[PDB]
C-alpha cells in the first residue's frame with residue numbers, strides 16, 4: 001500500500017504527535033492548563049484524548065475503556081441520526097414529496113393506517 | 126485463440142502475410158492490423174496502446190450516457206432536453222439543470238462554476254492516474270487493480286487476459302458507435318434512438334442515402 | 345539520372361545542402377523531400393511508399409473518370425449528369441442511371457444492390473492484394489508482375505525502373521490534380537471543364553481569387 | 564547545462580503529477596517540459612525535424628499575432644485603414660482604390676493581386692532556399708540559430724545567456740501559437756476582431772463569453 | 784459590507800426619489816471601466832477623485 | 834495647443850520614470866557604512 | 869462658438885488623456901525607460917539568494 005498525497009508529494013499519516021503521546025492537544029491551552037494536572041489515567045493512548053475530565057468521572061484505565069465503548073457507539077449513532085435528520089427535511093423543502101418532513105413529525109405520519117414515502121436520492125421516490 | 130501466433134486476425138483466413146512482424150499477439154486485442162505502419166517503434170506502440178485503452182473506456186461511458194437519457198425519456202420521464210447533443214444547453218434554461226427532471230436534485234444554474242469544479246477535479250484525478258495518488262503509486266498504468274478492483278474479478282491470469290480482451294473489444298465497438306453518433310447527429314439532426322425508430326419504421330427509404338445530396342457543393 | 349546520389353531533387357540548387365540521410369535514392373521518385381521526418385524508420389518508409397503508390401493509381405483512375413464524361417457530354421453525348429460530383433445522384437433519378445445515356449445499358453435503379461456488390465467484390469480483391477491469392481502468392485507487394493503484366497513491357501530491369509519512375513511521377517501529378525478537383529468543386533461549384541472554359545474566356549478577371557470572400561465568417 | 568531550465572531538475576508540464584518524463588526527453592533542449600504523451604518523437608531524427616518545425620512555426624506565429632493585433636488597434640484609435648480586421652484585410656485589394664498602407668493613397672497603393680502574388684512567390688522561394696541551403700548571408704551556420712549576420716547586436720555571445728534567451732524565445736513562441744489558434748477559432752465562431760471580442764468581454768464578463776455562442780453550431 | 788447592502792436589509796440611499804430611504808442594491812456596478820475610472824480621475828475641482 | 838500638452842506630458846513622464854527607476858536601482862546599498 | 873477649446877477640464881478623463889496620442893506617449897516613454905533599466909540591471913547585482921538585501 002504505497003500512496004501519494006492528495007495534492008502531490010509524499011502520502012501517509014502526516015504527524016501523529018499532535019493527538020498521541022505526552023505532547024498533544026488539550027481542551028485548554030498551554031498557559032491555562034499545564035501538563036502536570038492531566039489525570040494519570042488520561043495518557044496519550046486512546047484516540048481523541050484531550051485530557052478532558054472534570055469531576056473525575058473516569059477513575060482508571062479499564063473504566064475509561066468501558067466508557068469509551070459507550071462514547072464510540074453513541075458517536076456513530078449520532079452521526080447517522082444527524083444525517084437522517086438533516087437530509088430528508090432539506091429534500092422535502094426543495095420540492096420532493098417526502099411526506100415525512102421534519103424529524104419530530106415523521107413518527108406520527110405512520111400512525112393510523114398511514115404509510116411513508118422513501119426517496120432514493122439518485123433514482124425515484 | 127486471441128493470443129499467440131494462431132490468433133484471430135483482421136482479415137480472417139486471408140491474413141497470414143498481412144500481419145506485420147512487430148505485432149506478435151502479446152497484447153490484448155492484437156489482430157495484427159497496422160497497414161499504415163504507425164507503431165513500428167515499440168515505445169510509440171506502447172503509447173498508442175495506452176491511448177487506445179483510455180479512448181475505449183471514455184467511449185464506453187459516453188455511449189452508455191448517450192443511450193440512457195433518451196430511453197428514459199421515451200419511458201415517460203420529463204428531462205427538459207433528452208437528446209444527447211442538445212442536453213448541454215439546458216443549463217441556460219430558467220429552471221436550470223435537474224437530474225432526471227426532479228427539481229430537488231442538483232438544480233444547477235451557473236455554467237462557469239460547474240466548469241471550474243470539473244477542471245479542478247478532473248485535473249486532480251488525471252494527475253493521480255499519471256503519477257499515482259491516494260489509491261496507490263506503484264501499479265500498472267493501465268490496470269492498477271487493488272483499490273480499483275474491489276470485487277476481485279481479476280485474480281487468475283488466464284481469466285484476467287480474457288477479461289482484458291473482452292474490455293478492448295467492447296471498447297472498440299463503443300468507439301465505432303460513438304463515431305457513428307457524431308456523424309449521425311451532424312447529418313441527420315435527431316437523436317440516435319429517434320434515428321433507429323425511423324429506420325425501423327421504413328428501412329427501405331429511411332437510411333443514410335436519403336441524405337446523400339445534403340452536402341452538395343452546388344453554388 | 346533518377347536512382348543515384350546525383351539525382352534531381354525537390355528544391356533544385358537549394359536541396360543538396362540539406363537532404364535526409366535515410367533517403368539514399370534506391371527507390372523511384374526519390375526527390376529527397378522528407379522535411380517532416382516521417383519516414384525515419386525503414387518499415388514506416390515502406391508502408392508510406394505502399395500507401396503513396398495505391399493513392400497514385402486510384403487517383404489516376406479517378407482523374408480519367410472525372411474528365412471523360414464531361415468531355416464526351418461536351419462533344420454531344422446525352423449524359424444524365426456530366427459533372428463528376430453530381431454524377432452519384434443519377435441512381436435516384438426516375439429513369440435510373442444509364443451508361444452513356446442509353447437506357448439499354450446497365451439501367452441501374454437501386455443503390456443498395458450496387459453498393460453491396462461493390463463491397464463484396466472489392467473486399468475479396470483487396471484481401472487478395474493484401475495477402476496473396478489466385479493471381480500469384482509471395483510476389484512483390486507493389487509490382488507483382490506476372491499475370492498482372494500480360495504485355496511484358498517491363499522485362500528489361502533498366503526499362504522496368506524507368507517505367508516505375510514514370511508511373512510514380514504520373515501518379516503524383518494525378519493526385520495533385522484530384523486534390524485540385526476536390527477544392528474547385530468545393531469552392532466554385534462547377535465542373536473542372538467548365539472551370540477551364542471560364543478561365544480561358546477571361547483569364548485575368550475570373551480565377552481563384554474571384555472566390556476569395558466566399559468563406560468569410562458571418563455575424 | 565547547469566540552469567533551472569535544463570537537466571533532470573527542469574520544470575515539467577504536469578507539476579508534481581508529471582512523474583518521470585520519457586527517456587528520450589533527457590532535457591537538453593529549450594522548453595523541454597517532457598510532454599510527449601503521444602510518443603511522436605521516439606526516433607531522434609523525427610525529434611530533430613519536429614524541433615525545427617516548432618521553432619519555425621513559433622517565429623511565424625509571433626510575427627502573425629503582432630501583425631493581427633497592431634492594425635486593428637491603430638484603426639480603433641482612428642487611423643483610416645481600408646479594413647482593420649485581421650481576417651478581412653486581404654479583401655482590400657478588391658476595393659476601387661486598391662490596398663493603401665496606413666490608409667494613405669501614396670503609400671504602396673497596390674492595385675493587382677497577381678503582381679503581389681508573383682513577387683511574394685519569387686522572394687519567399689529565394690528566402691526559404693537560402694534558409695535551407697546556405698546563401699549570401701552565411702553558408703556554414705546552424706539551421707535553426709544561424710547567428711552571424713542575423714544577430715547584429717551580439718545578444719548571444721554568452722552561452723548561458725544564449726540558453727536563457729533560447730528558452731525565452733521558445734516559450735514566447737508557444738504562447739503566440741496558442742494565441743493564433745485562438746485567433747482562428749474566435750474569428751470562425753464570433754465573427755469579430757480579437758480586440759472587439761476583448762472589448763465585449765470587458766463590457767460584461769458575466770454574459771459576453773464563449774458560452775454565449777455555444778448554441779451556434781447545433782444541427783437542425 | 785456587500786452582503787449587508789445586498790441581502791440583509793439595505794443601505795440608506797440618499798438619492799432615492801423624494802427623500803432618501805433604505806434600499807437594497809440589487810444591481811451593483813461591477814463594470815471594470817466605471818469602477819477604475821474613479822481611481823485614475825484627477826483630484827482637482829470638478830473631478831474630485833474617489 | 835495640444836502640442837504643448839504632448840510636450841509637457843512627455844517631459845513629466847520622463848522625469849517621473851527617472852525617479853521611479855532610480856530607487857529601484859539598489860538604492861539602499863548606496864550608503865557609505867560598513868555592513 | 870467664438871474660438872476653439874480642448875473642453876476637458878471637468879470631464880474627468882482617465883489620466884487626463886482625451887487623445888490616444890497622449891496614452892501612446894505615456895506608454896512609449898515608460899517602456900523606453902523600463903527597457904533601459906532592464907538592460908542596465910546587470911550592473912546592480914543579482915539578489916538570487918533567498919536572504920539578501922539591506923536588513924536588520
Ligand code: CHL
Pocket residue numbers: 133134135136137138139156297462463466467468471
Ligand atoms: C474474409 C473477409 C474479410 C475482409 C475483406 C475483412 C476486412 C476488414 N476487416 Mg476483418 N475482414 C474479413 C474477415 C474477418 N475480420 C475479422 C475481424 C476484424 C476486426 C476486429 C476488425 C476487422 C476490421 C476489418 C476492416 C479493416 C480495413 C478497414 O478498416 O477498411 C476500410 C475501408 C473500407 C471499409 C472500404 C470503403 C467502404 C466503401 C466501399 C466506400 C464507401 C464510399 C462512401 C460513400 C464515401 C462517401 C464519403 C465522401 C463524402 C468522402 C476491413 C473491412 C476492422 C474494422 O472493421 O474497422 C473499421 C476491425 O476492427 N476485422 C474476423 C474475425 C476473426 C474475420 C473472419 O473472417
Ligand code: CHL
Pocket residue numbers: 352353354355356357358375516683684687688689692
Ligand atoms: C529552384 C527553385 C525551386 C523552388 C523554390 C522549389 C520549391 C518547391 N518544389 Mg521543387 N522547387 C524548385 C526547383 C525544382 N523542383 C524540382 C522538382 C520538384 C518535384 C517533383 C516536387 C517539387 C515540389 C516543390 C514544392 C515543395 C512543397 C513546399 O516546400 O511547400 C512550401 C511552398 C508553399 C507553401 C507555397 C505557398 C504559395 C503561396 C506563397 C502561399 C499561398 C497563399 C494562400 C493565398 C493562402 C490562403 C490561405 C487559405 C488556405 C485559407 C516547392 C514549391 C513538390 C510539390 O510540387 O508540392 C506541392 C514536388 O512534388 N519540386 C525540380 C526538378 C529537378 C527543380 C529544378 O530546379
Ligand SMILES: CCCCCCCCCCCCCCCCCC(=O)OC[C@H](CO[C@@H]1O[C@H](CO[C@H]2O[C@H](CO)[C@H](O)[C@H](O)[C@H]2O)[C@H](O)[C@H](O)[C@H]1O)OC(=O)CCCCCCCCCCCCCCCCC
Pocket residue numbers: 724727895896898899900902906907909910
Ligand atoms: C506608474 C503607474 C502607471 C499606471 C499603473 C500601471 C500598473 C502596471 C502594473 C504591472 C507592471 C508593474 C511594473 C512595476 C515596475 C517594476 C518592474 C520590475 O521590477 O521588473 C524587474 C523584473 C526583472 O526581470 C528579471 O531580470 C533578470 C536579469 O536579466 C538580465 O540577465 C539575464 C540573464 O541572467 C538576461 O541576459 C537578460 O537579458 C538581462 O537583462 C532576468 O532576465 C530574469 O529572467 C528577469 O525575470 O522584470 C520583470 O518583472 C518583468 C517585467 C514586468 C512588466 C514590465 C512591463 C513594462 C511595460 C511593457 C510594455 C512596454 C511597451 C513599450 C512600447 C514602446 C514602443 C511604442
Ligand code: CLA
Pocket residue numbers: 029030031032
Ligand atoms: C492577535 C490575536 C492573538 C494571537 C495571535 C494569539 C496567539 C496565541 N495565543 Mg492568545 N489570546 C487572544 C488573542 C490572540 N492570541 C485573545 C483575544 C485572548 C482572550 C480570549 C487570548 C487568550 C489566550 C490564552 C489564555 C492563551 C493564549 C495562547 C496563545 C498561543 C497558542 C494558543 C492560541 O492560538 O490561542 C488559542 C485561542 C483561542 C482558542 C481563542 C478562540 C479563537 C477562535 C479561533 C475564535 C476566532 C475569532 C475570529 C477568527 C476573529 C474575530 C474577529 C473579531 C470578532 C475580533 C498563541 C501564541 C496560549 C499560550 O500562549 O499559552 C502559553 C494560552 O494559554 N491566548
Ligand code: CLA
Pocket residue numbers: 122186187189190191193194197204206207212213222223224225226231
Ligand atoms: C462520462 C460520461 C458521462 C457524462 C459526461 C455525462 C454527462 C451528463 N449526464 Mg449522463 N450518464 C452517464 C454518463 C455520462 N453523463 C451514464 C453512464 C449514465 C447511466 C447511469 C448516465 C445517466 C444520466 C441520466 C439519467 C441523466 C444524465 C444527465 C447528465 C447531465 C448532468 C450531469 C450531472 O449533473 O451529473 C452529476 C449528478 C450528480 C453528481 C448527482 C448524483 C448522480 C450520481 C453520480 C449518478 C451515478 C450513477 C451510477 C454511478 C451508475 C449507475 C448505477 C446503476 C447501474 C445502479 C450531463 C450532460 C442528466 C441530464 O441532464 O439529462 C440529460 C440526467 O438526467 N446522465
Ligand code: CLA
Pocket residue numbers: 354367371372373374375376377378381382383389392393395396399516517519520523
Ligand atoms: C497520401 C499520399 C502520399 C503518400 C503516402 C506519400 C508518401 C511519401 N512520399 Mg510522396 N507525394 C505525394 C503524396 C504522398 N506521398 C504528392 C501528392 C506529391 C506531389 C506534391 C508527392 C511528392 C513526393 C516527392 C517529390 C517525394 C515524395 C516522397 C515520399 C516519401 C517520404 C515523404 C513522407 O514521409 O511522406 C509521408 C506522407 C504522409 C504521412 C501523408 C500525410 C498527408 C497529410 C494528410 C497532408 C496531406 C494534405 C496536404 C496539406 C497537402 C498539401 C499539398 C496540396 C497542395 C496537394 C513517402 C513514401 C519522397 C521520397 O522519398 O520518395 C520515395 C520524395 O522525394 N513524395
Ligand SMILES: CC1=C[C@H](O)CC(C)(C)[C@H]1/C=C/C(C)=C/C=C/C(C)=C/C=C/C=C(C)/C=C/C=C(C)/C=C/C1=C(C)C[C@H](O)CC1(C)C
Pocket residue numbers: 598599600601602603620621623624626627628629630631648649650652653740741743744
Ligand atoms: C506538444 C504535443 C505533444 C503530444 O505528444 C502530441 C500533441 C498534443 C499533438 C502535441 C501538441 C501540439 C500542438 C498543441 C500544436 C499546436 C500548434 C499550433 C496551434 C500552431 C499554430 C500556428 C499558428 C501560426 C503559424 C500562425 C500564423 C499566422 C500568420 C502567418 C498570420 C498572417 C497574417 C497576418 C499577420 C494578419 C494579416 O491580416 C493576414 C495574414 C497574412 C493571415
